[PDB]
Amino acid sequence: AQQRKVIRCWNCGKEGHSARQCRAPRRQG
């Protein structure tokens, strides 16, 4: 429900958003 899991998006390498949420690199995010 609240989904509280700090994650370092592998996309660019930032923490606070999953790959799909990381709109930096174009690849599932």
Ligand SMILES: [Zn+2]
């Ligand atoms: Zn990121």
